[PDB]
Amino acid sequence: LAAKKQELEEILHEMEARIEEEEERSQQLQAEKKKM
Amino acid sequence: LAAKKQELEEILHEMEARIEEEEERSQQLQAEKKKM
Amino acid sequence: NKAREEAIKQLRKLQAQMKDYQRDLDDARAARE
Amino acid sequence: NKAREEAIKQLRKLQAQMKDYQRDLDDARAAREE
Question: Which one of A8, A21, A28 has the shortest CB-CB distance to B5?
Fold first, then answer.
């Protein structure tokens, strides 16, 4: 269970980086929207 | 810890669904870049 | 352990409320034209 | 008490998802009309 917890923490940090990239993609989206 | 890790794997599959959401968001970003 | 379900539900609610509130103004600005 | 709080929590995410779906449908309709 401890090794499983370590793996889950790894992929949860992966998902945190993914959420960061998600917010950056939303910034790019609003930039493209305002680009006029 | 067994129950905790089962719930964490459920949350991990939810994070995979969130990754699918990020893919959809990237598709929408490309559609916006190509549409406007 | 079962509190993790409530934590995930609260996280989903907080992540979806932002889009729920933003898409209304998005629709307003889009249909403004 | 924790089970009751969790039962009161799955509806918050569900209500937020329903509101997001409604607002996104409105946004898609406005974009199609534009």
Answer: A8
CA max distance for chain A: 53
CA nearest to A26, candidates B29, C31, C6: B29
What resolution, expressed in A, was reported for this entry? 4.3
H or E, element range at D32: helix D2-33
| Best B10, B25, B27, B35 residue to mutate vs chain A (most A CBs within 10 Å) | B25
CA distance C30 to D34: 6
**Residues from chain C contacting residue D22 (CB–CB below 8 Å):** 20
Report how this structure was experimentally obtained: cryo-EM
